[PDB]
Ligand binder design. Structure first.
Ligand SMILES: O=C(COP(=O)(O)O)[C@@H](O)[C@H](O)COP(=O)(O)O
Ligand SMILES: O=C(COP(=O)(O)O)[C@@H](O)[C@H](O)COP(=O)(O)O
Ligand SMILES: O=C(COP(=O)(O)O)[C@@H](O)[C@H](O)COP(=O)(O)O
Lengths: 109, 467, 467, 467, 157, 153
């Protein structure tokens, strides 16, 4: 009873899961806060795997002990750039690597 | 001063056993587990090891007095008997920084493990650990890239990476090889890979494989929107032939290649690691033949030494075992050498098999690769054991899916992401792993088919390599 | 034809155990000694070994059916239990010629011994022998020169050649090194040599050693009227650095260089052996680290496999052990692999550890080198065991002479020539050896001093590597 | 042992005729057809051939006794008279593997056919077949790619491939050359090609041809949606000039080049075949001058030897004759050497001219190319004789179409595909060929015009090269 | 560079040391997209444990392409090729050329005039612009009683 | 962790003067003899030297918080006045091993003496000594031959 796998563009981590509810998004941002990672919102007109850089929304949220504060920035960013992909990333400054990364908004249509 | 040549055989323990010695921070320290032959005392056995692995031979030579032997000789500075083992001891031996060629793992091995293992006066010998002093660590390049730079290069964050070894090991043509590669990668795996004994053979010559595989990477990447890679095996009969193969991989813009560091050797591997650094190609290190050396706990070299030697010689990935899979891996010591291959500072901890505190002076970590006899049911354990900074590899666990490669790849990628989400949310992968998997199988039919297929398959045997 | 994909785990013995198989002359045959885990049947253990070392993995993959698996799979075609050992077996496995890259020892090892040694279902595993088919042997260069050509190049006929390792192992400056070399060579030794862990170090950088040693060779040769040589160690961190060193040896007109084939690796060694053939430099192969692998008879690889692998990769000399010296060497199996490294055709003989008849298709032999803890009293035994086509090496047995190096060298050269004359005349070296030595000591005071010094020194321990 | 030098002339049959000899599997076997001069006995003639082609000369030399002549000498081990031919015999001669340089067709030919053909004591001599032992076959690279890999590279499956030689042979400028190439390829042919004597000439220098032809390939490929190629002739005065030309073809991304292996030579050809393997360029081998050597059955070398020599030296295509076309080709022996150039194992079969069973140890096959005086009416016969794995080439049969090149190409491609469909459906190409062609001509006006034009053109002469 | 009618504007990335190659390029992209003509390595950014040079060159090249595509103005980043040896300096300069980087950077006093003259020749033959940093100059030129005035060093450069 | 971007000029001595610092054996140590401009305190002068020769610039940058500044910054860990000289001090500054390219004297000089000598806030500056840690010394070749080998040659 085998299906042939559909071709579908993906967006790295969590993009094979059914889309994150806002509660699931907040659970991931809570994890960041607890882990001590600094949230950063980035947006891009495209999702090309080859490109290294998306555009930074404001600055990283360095002083953040509040998932809603992150969620507010995502809402605000999505308002200004609903035509764009928006992605939440966590940054570990001790190992200096981005530890978390998932798309929270794909562009309209 | 050096005064008085007296010809003839003396006891090694006269010159080489120095229980009052306190190791300098520039000393290379080795821990050996040995059993002396009957009537050979432990301290004379330890001193024989220190002697023949540094400066000494079997009689007195006058040439010693031309130099300053106190400053060059190895010093068996401590012996302790193994708790509960009869006639088994640890010798701890210090070696001066001066004894070693800078940046040469080949030379370090030739000294420490060159001859002493075949001493008639010794029944069995096993090197457990080496404390590489920071002054020596800094003469090596290390990983071409290492964990952080690799994730940045590939845009891969927030999870273990997923690979797949193409099967059968041997027999497929270059075209069918790339076929299997395309279907795996399009299904959601980050990497595919040559099996370690795919080099260049009558049924499939290497340049043909590189060419068809490059095409499969471009296609599957264009389709999925994620960076894809395939560890092309450049392991070869000669340096020249190895470079040739590495060069064509670069020409094709392949992000990652593969090398068998033990069967090819540390001299060739160090050449390749340097090349990779200069050419921005990632280096996956396969550990073929390691178990010939590291399996039995009475004789050989423990893998955690080989892992430290490779971090020095250079590799971006290294196979670390699965613990839970078809090949042997003790969990305690595996957590030990994964720390040794990943972290910058690892405290001594004998419960993890870590005999010496190791510092890496900011030398990049090596991604551990869990590969061998693992499938979807193992996923929560693999994530819990290794964490994000790992590559989990499913050969039969992808190509043996009922519906083929792409469904097989989706099953694993879904299983993985589910486990990572559950973990981030605070679920216990240990307790809730099968439930997290069954939940995900509710909405992923290809995952469900894999869970069904491999429900009964466990590998549970007595581990020979006990701490 | 290949018909029907059925996903899931089967028994290895279903596909890979083939007790009806008769090996083709082009098959590579391996003999493994193994102990299965409790509840793992011998034939399933043998088939697991054949599977994971050829084409198979742990579940069924559909990709098998794209190819012709019958013609690629390893075939465990015979199992026998070890006589008198409980739960120990020999598996004999045939591998198709197609599985191997031409002229690559690296690839052969990666396949045969890559992963199977760490199988959870297997307690211990040891590779005893490999029958290299002639069709494969012919894809290798082999020794750059080999026994006949070497003797012709050096004008050395009618006796074992005599060498000496300079001591201390480490610590001497380049000038004192050459000093010790000149005094040894002027005394009547054919060769001196770097110790295996002399590469390039703070106290003595390699180019300095090469330069001062070259001078010592010219002087001692001009004095004695015999060709002299010194195995300069070109073992290095990288291929590039190894070639650089080999190149300066050629520039100086040095007839012989030295390489550690296991700690440097087979890929680097094969590079060097090719170079040596093209540049007419003789290649002495040191076997450092071999005992980490080959000592214990339950797990590892027997040296006679490593010796065959090196004859293929390429070397003109190879250390073979002494039997009688400070390091372990079983006489029966030593005579076995000395034949394997010297002769063109060696019949199977299990009393010598020779599991398979080996043909070498006119590939040159490798001079065995007896080195380690031997002195003048050992000379009749060394000559009887090894015969003319050997190199006998006395490190401490030269530099530990009461009067120094040149008297030490004369003592050994006189002891040797006396034994060879006595042998040619029909004296029994076994019965009359000490008498032949005492007779020669009557007219050789430096020989007398050596006989005096080492009269009491024997190495007599239980050999771990029992057949 | 070798005992006793006796100067002077002996009979060859004393040393070299050995009718009791049974060839080893490593022996190279040759079959010669010869006529002795009157008063020269067959066995002395056979032994003279074996002698002068291996180790012997015309008098006794003392130097023989320095070596072991029994192990080096050629052995005429069998003679049989040709059935029905007066004073004609086959000699079968075995040559030790040791006599030949590894991987050198040049050396094999120099030994087997170097001098013996001009022996005064011999009226005529012809080499019919050579059994290349597997141990020797494995020292050669063989085809850069071979049949399977070529079809995979080009996406060409399920039919013979179609080519066309541009005409006139000489005279066209580079631009008109590419013009003719574009029109041929756009019409449905897979390949076009330089004539064998197009190299670099006043009226058309090679770099100009390569450039304009590359443009014609891109255009015709973009138009048709099928991979196109043109065998660019890199045959040249010197190796350097040959490499230069091959290099520019690679630079232009040309998938295939062309070489005349007999007029350029086996040393240059082997260089080129190696290059091609390393650079992924396909190698079409033209056989110009072969009929100077292989036509007459009393003297020379049969083509099936030359075809085996080329499979060893290296080529992906080789002209095999048409049987039905303007140049001579005996059907029975053509089916013989097509099997020899394609298959892995070919049983001895004297009705096909195959004197020895030949094994190729998985060395890739060579695509046979039928070219010379063929047209659409020949198509069913060409497909029946050669099958799918062939290239059928129409020079005049494309450019001599009434409407020009593109209609000419369509006519051939339609004729071909019709025949292949009919064959797959079970129609007999032998019986129904003209009907299949007339049917297709009903809906293909350009095919109809070609059928009309060449209805009367047959080549039916007595074949000189009778078995 | 198509730059006329005004001073050109650059920016040295901070902190001097400590940033990874990726964060370095991040800071470079944001600076350049904002309207600066150039960014630059600090003079003591060469190749270090926390950031090896080839990694910096690679991520910086990406940041230049992105910010240039966005703004419609030519962008550049002075990649520091100052190195322990001539060979290593050339190697670095060569990869900058390979990436199509319009400008590189050199410390002429701490590397030296012999290496600098080598690099200036190379740059002329390879069409790469050469930004010269003057590190260590004040060790020599500050005090008016002893040393060499900078205007000599400037003429020498 | 790194928390809170506050734009603007702070005192160097806030981040870079660390009189409690004990140098690691892998630290590169420098001894500077300096005279501050009038009204520039010795410790702020020492910290300015440590700052501009390691990681710091003249205002606060947000990019600091992307990295771990404690592990990269130079540390003016000691200041003493020169005995008998008015307005003259020694500053002792520790630099992490990580700041330097292996085997490059060019890079070491560019960092330690690159810019700090021309600081307006500083009247005069002189580098007296550098403690090259052994871990760094080992990344250099050193003399092609050196005294012993030369005499032998
Ligand atoms: O065949 C393999 C895995 O295949 P599969 O995924 O089909 O089990 C080997 O590469 C093992 O992973 C090697 O051992 P280590 O990783 O223990 O070195
Ligand atoms: O130190 C050595 C000999 O010194 P000495 O002559 O002073 O005993 C080694 O080279 C051993 O020969 C190596 O072992 P194998 O030869 O058994 O590989
Ligand atoms: O001129 C030719 C064909 O032209 P056309 O197609 O116009 O007849 C030659 O290439 C022959 O094919 C060579 O002989 P073999 O193929 O018999 O070697």
């Amino acid at each position: 009873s085998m299906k042939t796998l559909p071709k579908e563009r993906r967006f790295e981590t969590f993009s094979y899961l059914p889309p994150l509810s806002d509660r699931q998004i907040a659970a991931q941002i809570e994890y960041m806060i607890e882990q001590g990672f600094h949230p950063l919102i980035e947006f891009n007109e495209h999702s090309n795997p080859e490109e290294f850089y998306w555009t930074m929304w404001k600055l990283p949220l360095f002083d953040c002990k509040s998932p809603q504060q992150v969620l507010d920035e995502v809402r605000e960013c999505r308002s200004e750039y609903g035509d764009c992909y928006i992605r939440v990333a966590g940054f570990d400054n001790i190992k200096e690597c981005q530890t978390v990364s998932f798309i929270v908004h794909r562009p309209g249509r | 001063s050096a005064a008085g040549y007296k010809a003839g055989v003396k006891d090694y323990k006269l010159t080489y056993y120095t229980p009052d010695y306190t190791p300098k921070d520039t000393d290379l320290l080795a821990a050996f587990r040995f059993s002396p032959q009957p009537g050979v005392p432990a301290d004379e056995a330890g001193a024989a090891i220190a002697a023949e692995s540094s400066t000494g031979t079997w009689t007195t030579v006058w040439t010693d007095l031309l130099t300053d032997m106190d400053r060059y000789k190895g010093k068996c500075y401590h012996i302790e008997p193994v708790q509960g083992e009869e006639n088994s001891y640890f010798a701890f031996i210090a070696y001066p920084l001066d004894l070693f060629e800078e940046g040469s793992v080949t030379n370090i091995l030739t000294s420490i493990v060159g001859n002493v293992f075949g001493f008639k006066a010794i029944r069995s010998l096993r090197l457990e650990d080496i404390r590489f002093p920071v002054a020596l660590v800094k003469t090596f390049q290390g990983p071409p890239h290492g964990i952080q730079v690799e994730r940045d290069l590939l845009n891969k964050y927030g999870r273990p990476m997923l690979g797949c070894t193409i099967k059968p090991k041997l027999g497929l043509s270059a075209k069918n090889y790339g076929r299997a590669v395309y279907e795996c990668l399009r299904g959601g795996l980050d990497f595919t890979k040559d099996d370690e004994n795919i080099n260049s053979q009558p049924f499939q010559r290497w340049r043909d494989r590189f060419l068809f595989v490059a095409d499969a990477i471009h296609k599957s990447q264009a389709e999925t929107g994620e960076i894809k890679g395939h560890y092309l095996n450049v392991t070869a009969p000669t340096c020249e032939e190895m470079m040739k193969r590495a060069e064509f991989a670069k020409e094709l813009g392949m992000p990652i290649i593969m090398h068998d560091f033990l069967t090819a050797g540390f001299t060739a591997n160090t050449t390749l690691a340097k090349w990779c650094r200069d050419n921005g190609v990632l280096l996956h290190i396969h550990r073929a033949m390691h178990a010939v050396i590291d399996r039995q706990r009475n004789h050989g070299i423990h893998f955690r030494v080989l892992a430290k030697c490779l971090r020095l010689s250079g590799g971006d990935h290294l196979h670390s075992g699965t613990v839970v899979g078809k090949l042997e891996g003790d969990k305690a010591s595996t957590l030990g050498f994964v720390d040794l291959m990943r972290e910058d500072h690892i405290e001594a901890d004998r419960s993890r098999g870590v005999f010496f505190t190791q510092d890496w002076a900011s030398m990049p970590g090596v991604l551990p690769v869990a590969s061998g006899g693992i499938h979807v049911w193992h996923m929560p354990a693999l994530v819990e054991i290794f964490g994000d900074d790992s590559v989990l590899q499913f050969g039969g666990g992808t190509l043996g899916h009922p519906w083929g490669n792409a469904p097989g790849a989706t099953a694993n990628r879904v299983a993985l992401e589910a486990c990572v989400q559950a973990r981030n949310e605070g679920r216990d992968l240990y307790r809730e792993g099968g439930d997290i998997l069954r939940e995900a199988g509710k909405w992923s039919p290809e995952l469900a088919a894999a869970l069904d297929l491999w429900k009964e398959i466990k590998f549970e045997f007595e581990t020979m390599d006990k701490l």
